[PDB]
């Protein structure tokens, strides 16, 4: 009891993707790579983790996360299975693309109104 489990009707498991397009898209932006960066610049910054690999450093999480979300919504560079974490208490953006991440589809609510209109 409690060990055997069953998926939900809507539960879906990510099949898996590749991290290269995400790395390229994040490298084009104003993101200093971790290999060449002043250690004193890590405090007032947010650490980006992709598939558990610490790479790069950014100085504007509030815009980077929004850009990533819009890009994923448009389904052009990042597949719908990828998930981007925003940790607010500690500045860390941990992105994962490996398989096995159970997920489900949810509607989007911008301010107080959904996008699933009559159209």
Point out which residues bind another protein (CB under 8 A).
1-2, 13, 15-16, 34-35, 39-40, 42-43, 47, 51-55, 61-62, 88-91, 98-102
CB of residue 10 to another protein, shortest distance in Å: 14
Instruction: Give which of 94, 71, 96 is closest to 82, Cα–Cα.
Output: 96
Q: How far apart are CA 22 and CA 44, in angstroms?
A: 23
Name which of 25 and 69 has its Cβ closer to another protein: 69
| Nearest distance in Å: CB 62, another protein | 6
Beta carbon nearer to another protein, 28 or 90: 90
The minimum distance between CB 71 and another protein, in angstroms, equals 19
Task: Using the minimum distance from each CB to another protein, give the nearer residue, 77 or 103.
Answer: 103
Output the CA torsion 110→114→118→119 (10° steps).
40
Half-sphere exposure of 96 (CA within 13 A, CB side): 12
The CA distance from 55 to 47, in Å, is: 8
Taking the least distance from each CB to another protein, the nearer of 84 and 91 is: 91
């Amino acid at each position: 009891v409690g060990l055997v489990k069953n998926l939900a009707l809507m539960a879906y498991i990510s099949v898996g993707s590749q991290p290269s397009p995400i790395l390229e898209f994040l490298e084009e932006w104003s993101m200093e790579n971790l290999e060449e960066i002043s250690p004193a610049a890590i405090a007032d910054a947010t650490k980006i983790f992709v598939n558990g690999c610490w790479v790069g450093i950014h100085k504007d999480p509030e815009q980077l996360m929004n850009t990533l979300r819009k890009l994923r919504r448009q389904m052009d560079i990042i597949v719908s299975e990828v998930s981007m974490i925003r940790d607010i208490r500690e500045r860390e953006i941990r992105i994962y693309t490996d398989a096995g991440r159970i997920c489900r589809p949810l509607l989007i609510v911008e301010k107080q109104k959904l996008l699933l209109k009559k159209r």
